[PDB]
Amino acid sequence: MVNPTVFFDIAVDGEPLGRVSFELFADKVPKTAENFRALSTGEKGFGYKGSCFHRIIPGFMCQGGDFTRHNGTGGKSIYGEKFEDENFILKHTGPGILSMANAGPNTNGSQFFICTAKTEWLDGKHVVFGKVKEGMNIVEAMERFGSRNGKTSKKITIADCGQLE
Numbered sequence: 389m390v391n392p393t394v395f396f397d398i399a400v401d402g403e404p405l406g407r408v409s410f411e412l413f414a415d416k417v418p419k420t421a422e423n424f425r426a427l428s429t430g431e432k433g434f435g436y437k438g439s440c441f442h443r444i445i446p447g448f449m450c451q452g453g454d455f456t457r458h459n460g461t462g463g464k465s466i467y468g469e470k471f472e473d474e475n476f477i478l479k480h481t482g483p484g485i486l487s488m489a490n491a492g493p494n495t496n497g498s499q500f501f502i503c504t505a506k507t508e509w510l511d512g513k514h515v516v517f518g519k520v521k522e523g524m525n526i527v528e529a530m531e532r533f534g535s536r537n538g539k540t541s542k543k544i545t546i547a548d549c550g551q552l553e
């Protein structure tokens with residue numbers, strides 16, 4: 389029926405900041421949207437709750453989802469360690485776009501990023517699968533703890549997450 393909505397409750401050094409919610413585009417990328425949905429509810433017995441945004445670059449993006457190595461080298465999908473690029477129907481049009489991190493063709497896992505600018509050079513290379521719905525102000529707040537090389541000045545965590553609606 390209706391595209392799912394998920395939330396993240398963000399904290400900064402363990403202090404609550406606020407909530408970001410996302411629309412996931414199951415109508416266009418059902419397999420990639422499902423992966424992110426189920427990681428967010430934790431229903432397969434693993435997922436995003438307690439993980440961090442390990443790399444944040446102001447004027448670029450906030451990246452997270454590495455719940456096995458905590459640093460951009462780990463993570464796994466609900467389909468296996470890696471899965472294929474589903475399609476590239478949606479493009480990186482500006483701030484708020486949710487897209488899959490990868491290390492080569494057909495290597496999607498659990499890592500994702502939230503754009504904070506237009507990143508058109510990733511079109512056709514990273515699968516876009518959602519967008520921030522509410523709390524873009526919380527994303528901009530998070531983004532101020534990043535740096536040019538992406539190291540964060542305070543620890544940015546998903547204190548809680550799950551499905552709304």
Ligand SMILES: NC(=O)C1CCCCC1
Nearest residue numbers: 449451488489490491501
């Ligand atoms: N190689 C990657 O997955 C990165 C692409 C640029 C945005 C952060 C994820």
